[PDB]
């Protein structure tokens, strides 16, 4: 699925929340 249409209406905080949800919080785990 393309995410562009969703991301276009979101703040940076909301965008990064969604992206980090989809990558399973990769930056914050072993």
């Amino acid at each position, epitope marked *: 699925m393309e*995410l*562009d249409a969703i*991301l276009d209406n979101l703040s940076d905080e909301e965008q*990064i929340e969604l*992206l*980090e949800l989809l*990558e399973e919080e*990769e*930056n914050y785990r072993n």
Partner: antibody, heavy 130, light 110 residues
Framework: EVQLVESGGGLVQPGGSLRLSCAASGFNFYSSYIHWVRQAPGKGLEWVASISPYSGSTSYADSVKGRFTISADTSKNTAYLQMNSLRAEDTAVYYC???????????????????????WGQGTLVTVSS | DIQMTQSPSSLSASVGDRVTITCRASQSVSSAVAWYQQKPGKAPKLLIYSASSLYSGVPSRFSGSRSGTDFTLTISSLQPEDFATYYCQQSVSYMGPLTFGQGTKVEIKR
């Protein structure tokens, strides 16, 4: 084949204006993002501006906000960079480059997939000098 | 803004060696990182996109990896034609600022 061709560069006096063009061929222009990226002589790459022809959304580097305007003519598959109040520090080779649609996609098997600038123009030199 | 701190600024290595170039993002950029190769007087060419995907037509000696906010470009068997300046670039902000690392100049020994 995918092609991006820049034009409009050259010499301009400080405080002057120039308009660059980027003629695109060989891909779905509505279904793209167009970026301008510049390189001062001997220096690194600096993103300048981006546009989505489909939404019309635009974005600019802080270094050019209020002076530069990016636009597109979908009937012409062309993007433009209007540069006003040019300064010596704007002297650079200016490249047009593209993302193919989408900027980012997601499939449970592969994860997130981000686009990158796979095609670039040859660049056009802008010299700001008296 | 998100900064990309690229290292080293220059390196020199013999043909055949394994070369490593790294970029640390100042905050999360997901995997939205590309690597480009620029030869003198030419536009940059894409090597790696989405942190770890090899772009079509690029030799398999190029690879990209991610560990959190740290990103690495590895050139496994360095060749004379690999003389270039290499750049990382992040694009995590949709229709937002794109930022580049400062570049790495690679010299080939002979």
């Amino acid at each position: 084949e995918v092609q991006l061709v820049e034009s409009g560069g050259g010499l301009v006096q400080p405080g002057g204006s120039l308009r660059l063009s980027c003629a695109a061929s060989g891909f779905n222009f509505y279904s793209s993002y167009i970026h301008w990226v510049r390189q001062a002589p001997g220096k690194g790459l600096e993103w300048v501006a981006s546009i989505s022809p489909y939404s019309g959304s635009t974005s600019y580097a802080d270094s050019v906000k209020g002076r530069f305007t990016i636009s597109a003519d979908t009937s012409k598959n062309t993007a433009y960079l209007q540069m006003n109040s040019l300064r010596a520090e704007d002297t650079a080779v200016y490249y047009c480059a593209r993302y193919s649609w989408p900027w980012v996609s997601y499939k449970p098997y592969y994860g997130l997939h981000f686009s990158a600038m796979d095609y670039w123009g040859q660049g056009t030199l802008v010299t700001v000098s008296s | 803004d998100i900064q990309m701190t690229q290292s080293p600024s220059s390196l020199s290595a013999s043909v055949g060696d394994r070369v490593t170039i790294t970029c640390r993002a100042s905050q999360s950029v997901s995997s939205a990182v590309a690597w480009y190769q620029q030869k003198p007087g030419k536009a940059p060419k894409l090597l790696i996109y989405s942190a770890s995907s090899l772009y079509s037509g690029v030799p398999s000696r190029f690879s990209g990896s991610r560990s959190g906010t740290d990103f690495t470009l590895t050139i496994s068997s360095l060749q004379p034609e690999d003389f270039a300046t290499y750049y990382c670039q992040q694009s995590v902000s949709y229709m937002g600022p794109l930022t580049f690392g400062q570049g790495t100049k690679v010299e080939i020994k002979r």
